[PDB]
């Protein structure tokens, strides 16, 4: 009752399993189905501990003993030994080769045996390199005992040295273990006196007798460099210092800095780094001086591998040389931040400064330059092709800020943090990279923590954490306004965004900056309208394309912000912006047109920016009425909508949407002589052109003009509405020349719906708004597009006109339900409901979800309750109102079981059945399966009752008779009908002779397969005919005769498919042919060629006919 511990558990979950695999290996070796699977399972098991390999440390004793006991066996084969090393390699992979190898035997009785083992190992064996790789590392650990080889004594250091020097040129992975072996064997006190000069001479000769062109030479030089580095690392200062100058002199003629190998340069840099420390006691050494010049030149390496080594060397060397020569190292680091340098030099200097800060090799005097140096790094960005460099520099500067913060005391970093607080909060929110923002936020949090007392620190910490920063869309908008409230984080952000991000190379960044400035301007009207708006009106006429696009959006947003701030106090807009800004904003389109800038690919951004500016100015009520600027804007808007086909489809809808949004604001802003009326001249002129452009051969122009007409206000459409409605209806219709124009019909319906929603409803005024006189024509036009199934090489593009029609009908119903409900007739409402239900059972998963949503929105509605909804009481039960957000209609597995229940209602039985037919038979396998399952589950209650099944069959036959010669429904329905007559649903109709369901259906089937070239229809008919054999009477004689005629079809595949289907239909059913007559027929069907000359096929057919008693 004082302190208790929690219920612990072993970290290794696969303990029994791993040991069970380690105890069944003397049976595994021998086969490739037991050794490839067993070793494949060990790899997967070991991959679950790569991040935290320390958890498997306790299990590094038995796993090794279960393998060494087998390896040390003379009776075991070689395949088991090599398999033993293969498994051991995987263990060293996870943990490592610097700890797991310290447990193997290291006695004196394990030197000669291992040396002999390796002797037999043939280097020419790629199927067993793991064995040699492990043996080279095991033999090196044995060379760490105080014993002397003299007691063991063509010698043992003559056999071990020759084998070690052999793997210094190989290309396999074993070249790394050779360096460790040579470093752990030569550094011995009895090996460094008789053999430390021979190896040095050999290495010096190899470094000179090699070149960077050959392949083997590169590997040899790499191995020699690794060996020398390992020797200098594991070598005392009283043994390597003598030979430290010759090695450096030999390494300088290697000209590693001038080559095409990164590994060689890295190894050389690391070797010279280690040499520099070897000279300096734990400067005077000429090598150390040279060592220095080398690392700083290495800081300009064009690889993100050697720069880290160079920085580490510059950081470690300075920690030895006195402060007399240390002020030189820091001075060079600062020279790497010069303007005439590449970002690589900046990154190297930042790494060097971080090393110095973490190692305390820096004085407060250097901070004066470090502050300005790190402030220039965070704002480093240069253009270069289709991208820009600067991520690594800023990341490096952020890493430098964090290290210095964690090193010195709070007092020693007061001015530094006080000055950098403004640079980190900017680089942590308005940045294009996510990692840089996270690093800046972490550095700011670290600086605020140790410093403790920080003006407004906890707020910025809680508002900007590791997760909140992750969203750059909320950083520019959500986090942007919070920190902006502080008086010491306002102008720095606005100026930064105006200088850097409105002229960026990425357009998304410019858009985000423009959207952020809209909110940042609310908390600074004077500054934004006195110092910022002038600079932006100066950048609109610059040679840079993106700069103008950004400045236009910035000015447009500032204008709307100042308009909002003025409306909040009931004041005009001129109070904020002087006359100079008003005159400048009005002289933009003129200058852009006089210079001919609306050409080429770059002309799209200019047009978009101009449209956005015009929209923002019209939505702010500017004093531009009665001025040529309005005419110029109108001409530009008309030209943009006319030249839409030239714009790429990737950015074609945005331009049209912006133009439509700007046109609606412009007219409602200037075209109004007096309240309630407008200038008849401009209205007449605009209506003229719009009624002469919807008949423009091009489809893009028609779509643009339709969307423009749809976005017009209500007062402008007063007095002239019957003509616009007739034009829209004529455009939505189709003609022999206009067939592949689905977008046109879509936009027409959208504009019709928008106009109907805008004008509303008015009694006794067909020209002013919609009323009970023209509503009938509107409904007839909206319902005429439902029977749209455009089938070009782009798929069924009639769905684009079906969805828009339903959306327009729903809006019209919702509008008329709130005003004059009498307009909503009963027959029209019933037709609309049936059409909406028909679309709630299509093959496409996405088109079925929107249909169901529209159906639920039309049904569930009581504001006020809609009149003329069929079976309204029955559907309220089918669809509970508390289950709307719990049925994914996009899944056919959740859509079929519900829509199928509508068949019970006589009203919802024709359209629903027609919609389920196309889905019951189709191509998709999952949809067909679900539909068939739903059908079989629904028929369980309408089969024993001959009244319901009879009506269902009658309706099905009636539907079959109405879409005859139509291929969009005939073939699917044939497969469906087959999907049902095989399930045996109509087994209550097979007890009748010449049953009608069968007579009419058989006639309709042969009325569809007549002269049918589509082999699919022929196969469907052949399969359907065989299903009618269950019906006795004349129906069974007619089916046999029809099947016999198809045996001599023009195509040979059909002659065989019919026989194959007959061979199955005669065996599945019974009481069809005489038992004695049945053997001969089967024999003839199995002894007949239906892909050979029709000379014999006709005779074989006549034989079967005579045997079955059928004339021909």
């Amino acid at each position: 009752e004082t302190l208790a511990f929690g219920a612990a558990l072993e970290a290794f979950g696969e303990s029994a399993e791993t040991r069970a695999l380690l105890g069944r290996l003397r049976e595994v070796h021998g086969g490739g189905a037991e050794r490839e699977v067993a070793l494949e399972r060990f790899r997967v098991i070991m991959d679950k501990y790569q991040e935290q390999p320390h958890l498997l440390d306790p299990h590094l004793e038995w796993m090794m003993n279960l393998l060494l006991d087998i390896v040390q066996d003379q009776t075991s084969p070689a395949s088991l030994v090599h398999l033993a090393f293969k498994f051991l390699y995987i263990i060293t992979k996870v943990r490592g080769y610097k700890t797991f190898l310290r447990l193997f035997p290291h006695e004196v009785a394990d030197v000669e045996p291992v040396l002999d083992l390796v002797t037999i190992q043939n280097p020419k064996d790629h199927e067993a390199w793991e064995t040699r790789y492990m043996l080279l590392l095991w033999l090196s650990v044995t060379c760490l005992i105080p014993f002397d080889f003299s007691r063991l004594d063509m010698s043992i250091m003559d056999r071990i040295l020759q084998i070690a020097e052999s793997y210094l040129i190989v290309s396999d992975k074993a070249r790394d273990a050779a360096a460790v072996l040579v470093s752990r064997f030569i550094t011995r006190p009895d090996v460094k006196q008789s053999k430390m000069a021979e190896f040095l001479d050999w290495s010096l000769c190899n470094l000179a007798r090699s070149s960077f062109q050959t392949m083997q030479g590169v590997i040899t030089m790499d191995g020699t460099l690794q060996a020398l580095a390992q020797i200098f690392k594991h070598g005392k200062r009283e043994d390597c210092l003598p030979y430290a100058a010759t090695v450096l002199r030999c390494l300088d003629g290697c000209r590693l800095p001038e080559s095409n190998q990164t590994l060689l340069r890295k190894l050389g840099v690391k070797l010279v780094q280690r040499l520099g420390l070897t000279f300096l006691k734990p400067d005077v050494p000429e090598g150390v001086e040279r060592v220095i010049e080398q690392l700083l030149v290495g800081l300009k390496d064009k690889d993100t591998v050697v720069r880290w080594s160079a920085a580490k060397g510059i950081g470690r060397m300075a920690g030895r040389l006195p402060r007399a020569l240390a002020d030189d190292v820091v001075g060079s680091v600062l020279d790497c931040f010069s303007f005439q340098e590449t970002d690589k030099a900046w990154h190297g200097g930042c790494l060097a400064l971080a090393e110095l800060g973490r190692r305390g090799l820096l004085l407060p005097s250097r901070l004066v330059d470090v502050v300005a140096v790190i402030l220039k790094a965070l704002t480093y960005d240069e253009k270069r092709g289709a991208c820009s460099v600067g991520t690594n520099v800023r990341d490096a500067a952020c890493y430098v800020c964090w290290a210095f913060a964690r090193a010195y005391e709070p007092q020693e970093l007061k001015p530094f943090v006080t000055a950098i607080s403004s640079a980190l909060v900017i680089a942590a929110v308005f940045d294009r990279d996510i990692n840089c923002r996270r690093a800046a936020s972490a550095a700011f949090q670290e600086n605020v923590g140790r410093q403790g007392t920080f003006p407004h620190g906890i707020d910025i910490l809680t508002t900007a954490d590791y997760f909140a920063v992750g969203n750059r869309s909320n950083c520019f908008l959500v986090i942007s306004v919070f920190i902006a409230g502080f008086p010491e984080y306002t102008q720095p952000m606005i100026d930064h965004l105006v200088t850097m991000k409105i002229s960026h190379w990425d357009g998304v960044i410019r858009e985000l900056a423009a959207r952020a400035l809209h909110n940042l301007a609310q908390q600074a009207p004077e500054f934004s309208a006195t110092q910022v708006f002038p600079r932006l009106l100066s950048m609109t006429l610059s040679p840079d394309l993106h700069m103008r696009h950004g400045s236009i959006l910035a000015c447009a947003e500032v204008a709307y912000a100042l308009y909002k701030l003025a409306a909040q106090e009931n004041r005009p807009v001129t109070d904020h912006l002087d006359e100079q800004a008003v005159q400048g904003l009005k002289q933009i389109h003129q200058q852009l047109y006089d210079r001919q800038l609306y050409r080429g690919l770059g002309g799209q951004l200019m047009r978009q920016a101009v449209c956005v500016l015009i929209e923002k100015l019209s939505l702010s009520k500017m004093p531009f009425r009665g001025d040529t600027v309005i005419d110029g804007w109108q001409w530009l808007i008309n030209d943009t909508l006319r030249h839409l086909h030239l714009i790429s489809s990737h950015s074609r809808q945005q331009m049209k949407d912006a133009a439509v949004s700007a046109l609606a604001a412009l007219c409602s802003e200037y075209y109004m002589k007096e309240p309630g009326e407008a200038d008849p001249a401009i209205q007449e002129e605009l209506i003229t052109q719009y009624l002469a452009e919807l008949r423009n051969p091009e489809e893009m122009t028609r779509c643009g003009f339709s969307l423009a007409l749809g976005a017009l206000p209500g007062f402008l459409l007063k007095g002239r509405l019957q003509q616009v409605l007739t034009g829209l209806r004529a455009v939505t219709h189709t003609s022999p020349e206009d067939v592949s124009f689905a977008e046109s019909r879509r936009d027409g319906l959208k504009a019709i719906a928008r106009i109907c929603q805008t004008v509303g409803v008015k009694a006794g005024a067909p020209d002013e708004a919609v009323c009970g006189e023209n509503v009938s024509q509107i409904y007839c036009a909206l319902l005429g597009c439902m029977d749209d199934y455009t089938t070009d090489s782009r798929g069924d593009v009639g769905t684009w006109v079906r969805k828009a029609a339903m959306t327009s009908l729903m809006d019209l119903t919702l509008l008329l339900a709130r005003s004059q409900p009498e307009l909503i007739e009963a027959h029209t409402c019933e037709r609309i409901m049936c059409c909406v239900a028909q679309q709630a059972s299509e093959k496409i998963d996405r088109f079925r979800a929107h249909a169901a949503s529209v159906f639920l929105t039309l049904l569930h509605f009581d504001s006020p309750p809609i009149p003329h909804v069929p079976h309204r009481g029955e559907l309220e039960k089918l669809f509970p109102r508390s289950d709307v957000a719990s049925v994914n209609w996009s899944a056919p597995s959740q859509a079929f079981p519900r829509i199928t229940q509508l068949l019970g209602l006589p009203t919802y039985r024709y359209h629903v059945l027609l919609g389920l037919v196309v889905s019951l038979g189709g191509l998709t396998e999952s949809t067909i399966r679900h539909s068939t399952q739903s059908l079989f589950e629904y028929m369980k209650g309408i089969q024993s009752d001959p009244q319901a099944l009879g009506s269902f069959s009658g309706t099905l036959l009636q539907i079959f008779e109405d879409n005859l010669l139509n291929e969009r429904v005939s073939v699917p329905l044939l497969k469906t009908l087959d999907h049902v007559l095989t399930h045996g649903c109509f087994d209550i109709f097979t007890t009748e002779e010449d049953h009608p369901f069968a007579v009419k259906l058989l006639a309709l089937c042969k009325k569809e397969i007549k002269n049918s070239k589509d082999i699919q229809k022929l196969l469907s008919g052949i399969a359907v005919f065989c299903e009618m054999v269950q019906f006795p009477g004349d129906v069974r004689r007619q089916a046999l005769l029809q099947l016999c005629l198809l045996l001599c079809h023009r195509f040979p595949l059909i002659r065989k498919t019919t026989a194959s289907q007959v061979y199955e239909t005669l065996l599945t059913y019974s009481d069809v042919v005489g038992a004695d007559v049945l053997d001969e027929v089967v024999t003839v069907l199995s002894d007949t060629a239906w892909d050979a000359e029709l000379a014999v096929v006709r005779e074989q057919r006549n034989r079967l006919c005579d045997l079955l008693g059928v004339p021909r």
Binding site: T304, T791, G795
Partner: protein
């Protein structure tokens, strides 16, 4: 000289790439050292597409090898042709992604990617006329799922005028027992569909079935699945490494086999399929292969090209055979008035002829289709994802790294739109 740089990522992408390199190297007549000892001049006329002339006539592959853990990089280094790879092209880390997209995308993988960008630039600077790139990884892993979707984005942002090809490998519950498989696959598909010109899906479920039933095996291994993958890749890259009348490089292919930007997934195949060791059974004829290839049995993707519609189909016949015979054979197949008519063979097919036969046969044909039947596997992956998304079980592992449910919802919405588009172009016919 149109060069094609190759890239390798993950363990499955670093195991298939080395095998493909070893395979193609046995057709261009190159030995482990580097010298050339061929017996035909038609091999050097287009060898620079994947090699570079060096001192002494030594051809060197342009391959970048990348992993977040060492083992895989250790293996290829000691392979039968691991000495032909440039020692400076191997870059990797000491900790993997633990089968976590974020672990190899927004954290561990976001650092080593910088080193991969320098190597790519160095390799591109040597080519006189760069064309595109290639990548091979897995969608069931964590370093081959997130660290390879980053490289594509970088290559697209820095080189928007270059082509990008990939060879994704969709995982299976029959080959893998991982539980978060649907997450990584969906996160990779969300990024590939947005910035990819071509894709070659390889189902681990179809290969397993073909190796179990057809080849009759009790306990198949990754060796059996890789043997067929290496064959298919080579059968597909036959018109990019050998001459022929049907001249069409990577760009021309992407312009012909991919009409719509979003729709770019293919369904590669190969036949006859055999196991390792025994392969040279008999010399198959032209019509036998013409029927064996269109067999769904010989498809590397577990779908059904029959139920749907073929958008773009091609063929690359191999072995000693004249184009006249292939034309005559295809003529009767596309004719109903003949006993040699078939209902499960496309009509419009861009066939080709090649003299050099494959390795282990005198005849072989590759199928490069683009049917809409692939939507099946897409819808299968969405159901598996929703099976665990509804509970958000194991969902706090990705959110704790930096991601958010918004990305998953956007990926699901994009996959649904792609499935709807695939289902839309199933009735696209000139009438």
């Amino acid at each position: 000289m149109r060069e094609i740089v190759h890239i390798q990522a993950g363990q499955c992408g670093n195991q298939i790439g080395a095998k493909f390199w070893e395979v193609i190297s046995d057709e261009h007549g190159i030995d482990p050292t580097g010298t050339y000892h061929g017996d035909s001049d038609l091999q050097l006329d287009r060898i620079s597409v994947y090699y570079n002339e060096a001192t002494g006539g030594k051809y060197v592959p342009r391959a970048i090898l990348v992993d977040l853990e060492p083992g895989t990089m250790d293996s290829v280094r000691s392979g039968p042709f691991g000495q032909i790879f440039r020692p400076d092209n191997f870059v990797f880390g000491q900790s993997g992604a633990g089968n976590n997209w974020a672990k190899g995308h927004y954290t561990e993988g976001a650092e080593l990617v910088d080193s991969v960008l320098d190597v790519v630039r160095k390799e591109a600077e040597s080519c006189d006329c760069l064309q595109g790139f290639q990548l091979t990884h897995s969608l069931g892993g964590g370093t081959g799922s997130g660290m390879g979707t980053l490289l594509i984005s970088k290559i697209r942002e820095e080189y928007p005028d270059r082509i990008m090809n990939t060879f994704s490998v969709v995982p299976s519950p029959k080959v893998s027992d991982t539980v978060v498989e649907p997450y990584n696959a969906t996160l990779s598909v969300h990024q590939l569909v947005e910035n990819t010109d071509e894709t070659y899906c390889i189902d681990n479920e179809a290969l397993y079935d073909i190796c179990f039933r057809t080849l009759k095996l009790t306990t198949p291994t990754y060796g059996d699945l890789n043997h067929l993958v290496s064959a298919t890749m080579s059968g597909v890259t036959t018109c990019l490494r050998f001459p022929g009348q049907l001249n069409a490089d990577l760009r021309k292919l992407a312009v012909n086999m991919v009409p719509f930007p979003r729709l770019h997934f293919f369904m590669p195949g190969f036949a006859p399929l055999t196991s390792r060791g025994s392969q040279q059974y008999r010399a198959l004829t032209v019509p036998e292969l013409t029927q064996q290839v269109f067999d769904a049995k010989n498809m590397m993707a577990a779908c059904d090209p029959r139920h749907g519609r073929y958008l773009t189909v091609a063929a690359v016949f191999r072995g000693r055979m004249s184009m006249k015979e292939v034309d005559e054979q295809m003529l009767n197949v596309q004719n109903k008035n003949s006993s040699y008519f078939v209902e499960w063979i496309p009509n419009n097919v861009k066939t080709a002829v090649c003299d050099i036969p494959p390795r282990g046969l005198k005849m072989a044909v590759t199928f490069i289709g683009n049917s809409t039947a692939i939507q099946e596997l897409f819808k299968r992956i969405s159901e598996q994802f929703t099976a665990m998304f509804r509970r958000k079980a194991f969902l706090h592992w990705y959110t704790g790294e930096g991601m958010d449910e918004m990305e998953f919802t956007e990926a699901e919405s994009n996959m649904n739109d792609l499935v709807s588009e695939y289902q839309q172009y199933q009735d696209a016919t000139a009438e």
